[PDB]
Amino acid sequence: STLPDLAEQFAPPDVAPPLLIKLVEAIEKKGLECSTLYRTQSSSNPAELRQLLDCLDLEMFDVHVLADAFKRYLLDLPNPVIPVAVSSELISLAPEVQSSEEYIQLLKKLIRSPSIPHQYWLTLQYLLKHFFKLSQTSSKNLLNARVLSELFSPLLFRFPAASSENTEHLIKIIEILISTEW
Amino acid sequence: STLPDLAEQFAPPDVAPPLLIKLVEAIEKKGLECSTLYRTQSSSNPAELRQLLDCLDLEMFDVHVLADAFKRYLLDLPNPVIPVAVSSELISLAPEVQSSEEYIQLLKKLIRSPSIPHQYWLTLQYLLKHFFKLSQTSSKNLLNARVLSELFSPLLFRFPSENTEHLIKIIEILISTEW
C-alpha cells in the first residue's frame, strides 16, 4: 500500500529492488524443490504480509509466507511490473499478428521505451530468471514455464481482460520468456 | 545522446544524480565568484561536452567547460527536470491564474505527483539549492535569482515566450526562498 514505485526502489547499476532480491533469494534457498510453492495459500492475511514488506532476515519466515508476500509485493506495486501502457498496446494487436516472436518484439520495444523507466524491464528480467530457475527443478517442484506464466501473468500484467486469443498471447509470451532465459 | 533518464541515474536514499553532484561541486569550487559563469559559450561543441558526461576529476577542467557541460546535461536529459505534463498545466492556467504563490503551490503539487518519479522533484530541489548558493555571491558573479531563472528556466522546463513569463517568475521565487 505504501510500496514505492519500482522506479523509486532502485536504480542501475543495481539489477532489481533490494526487497525483491531478499524475497527471491530466501524463497529459492528454502523452497526451490517444494511441490506446492506458489500454489497454496498461507495463513497470513494481506495486512500481515504487508507488515513483512517493511521490517530481520527473511530466511526466518515460513517459506509459504514468503511466497505469499512475494505475490503481495507484485500486487501492491503502484504500477505493475509490466505497465498498462504496454499491456494496452499488446491487447489491441490484431489476429493477423500471430507470431509469438512479434508479440515479444513489441513487449521489449514498448517496455524499453524512454517513457518507461528502465527499472520495469530490469525487474521483469529478474523475475523471469527466478521463474526459469524454478522450472529447472520441475521434476521435484512440478513447475514448468507455462504454469508459472498462468500463475504470475495476472500479477505481472494486472489486467482485467476477457480471455481471448489476446490474453492467451500474453500468457504465451511470458511462458516463452521464462523458457528462454538461458 | 545516451544520457539516462533522471529516474535511472539514482534512487532514494540518494538525493541527486551522482554526475550532477560532481558537476555542481566542481563548478561551485571554481566559479562561485566568476562574473561570467553560465553566460559565456566555451570552446567545446556538444559532442565534446557529451564525452565529459559519458565518462576523471572534474576539477581538472576549465570552469567554463564545466558550466557548458552542466547546460548540456540539462538539455540531454530524455525528459526535462520539470516534466512537460507539469509545464503544460502551468501554461494553460496562464491568463486565468495570476498569483505567484498559487503557481508555486501548484508546481510542487504537480511535480510531487505519484505518476512522476520522486527523482524529478529531488533533482529540482538540488538545482535550486545550487542556484541559491550562487545568488549569495551575486555582487561578484552577477547571478541573482532573476538572472538565474532567465538562464535556466528554458532548460528546466525545456521551452523554446509570453505565456512563459509566469514560469520564469516561479523559478525566481523558488531560488530566493531556499530556507
Residue of B15, B156, B5 whose CA lies nearest to B90: B156
Number of domains within chain B: 1
Q: What nine digits make up the cell of A107? A: 513487449
Interface probe, candidates A2, A112, A119, A121, chain B, greatest B C-beta count within 10 A: A119
The angle formed by the CA atoms of residues B81, B84 and B87, to the nearest 5 degrees, is: 90
Cell of A46: 494481506
Question: What single-letter DSSP state applies at residue A4?
Answer: P
Closest CA to B175 of B155, B157, B150, B148: B148
- Please, what is the end-to-end C-alpha distance for chain B in angstroms? 35
Q: What are phi and psi of A35, to 5 degrees?
A: -85, -5
CA-CA distance, A24 to B113, in Å (whole number)? 30
CB A112 within 8 A of CB A11: no
Contact status, residue A178 vs residue A103, Cβ threshold 8 Å: no
Residue B152 has which C-alpha cell?
A: 535556466
Dump the DSSP string for A25-77. HHHHHHHTT-TTTTTS--S--HHHHHHHTT---GGGS-HHHHHHHHHHHHHHS
The secondary element (H helix, E strand) that includes residue A147 is helix A145-157
What amino acid occupies position A157? F
CA distances from B74 to A46, B1, B112, B124, B152 (A): 43, 12, 20, 11, 9
Q: Enumerate helices (H) and strands (E) in chain B, giving the number of each.
A: 10, 0
Cβ contact A106:A89 at 8 Å:
yes
Is residue A13 reached through a cis peptide bond, with omega within 30 degrees of 0 on the bond before it? yes
Nearest to A119 by CA among B4, B125, B83: B4
Domain range enclosing A146: 1-182
Cβ within 8 Å, pair A78-B114: yes
- Burial letters A160-172, b for 16+ CB under 10 A, else e: eeeeeebbebbbb
CA A115/CA A113 separation, integer angstroms = 5
Contact A129, A46 (CB under 8 A): no
A122: nearest CA partner in chain B: B8
Phi, psi (5° rounding) for residue B143? Answer: -100, 100
Measured between beta carbons, the chain B residues lying within 8 angstroms of A12 are 4, 8
Break sites following residues in chain A (C–N > 2.5 A)? 55
End-to-end Cα spacing for chain A: 34
- Asked how this structure was determined, the answer is X-ray
Residue B23: CB atoms within 10 Å: 22
| A9 contacts in chain B (CB < 8 Å) | 11
Long-range pairs for A55-60: beta carbons < 8 A, 24 or more residues apart: A57/A26, A58/A22, A58/A23, A58/A26, A59/A26, A59/A29, A59/A30
Kindly state the DSSP code that residue B37 receives in the 8-state scheme.
T
CA torsion sign, A118 to A120 to A125 to A129? positive
Nearest by CB to B118, from A8, A12, A118: name it: A8
Q: How far is Cα B99 from Cα B13, in angstroms, rounded to an integer?
A: 34
Distances (CA, A) of A154 to A28, A55, A170, B55: 22, 27, 10, 41
| Spatial distance between the Cα atoms of B175 and B106, rounded to a whole number of angstroms | 16
Q: Are residues A111 and A121 in contact, defined by beta-carbon separation less than 8 angstroms?
A: yes
Collect all residues from A whose CB is shorter than 8 A from any CB in B.
4-5, 7-12, 78, 114, 117-119
Question: Tell me, what DSSP letter sits at residue A95?
Answer: T
The span from the CA of B152 to the CA of B170, in Å, is: 12
Residues of A in Cβ contact (< 8 Å) with B78: 114
Q: How far apart are CA A47 and CA A72, in angstroms?
A: 10
A156–chain B nearest CA distance, Å: 19
Write the CATH number for A110. Answer: 1.10.555.10
The answer to whether the Cβ–Cβ distance between A7 and B9 falls below 8 Å is no
Distance from CA of B166 to the nearest CA of A (A): 27
SS3 content of chain B, % helix, strand, coil (to 5): 65, 0, 35
A-B CB pairs within 8 A amount to 37
Can you tell me the distance from the alpha carbon of B39 to that of B148, in angstroms, rounded to the nearest whole number?
10
In sequence order, the 6+-apart residues with CB closer than 8 A to the CB of B39 are B151
The alpha helices in chain B, defined as continuous H runs, are: 6-9, 18-31, 46-53, 63-76, 84-92, 100-111, 118-135, 138-141, 145-153, 165-176
Residue type, B68: D
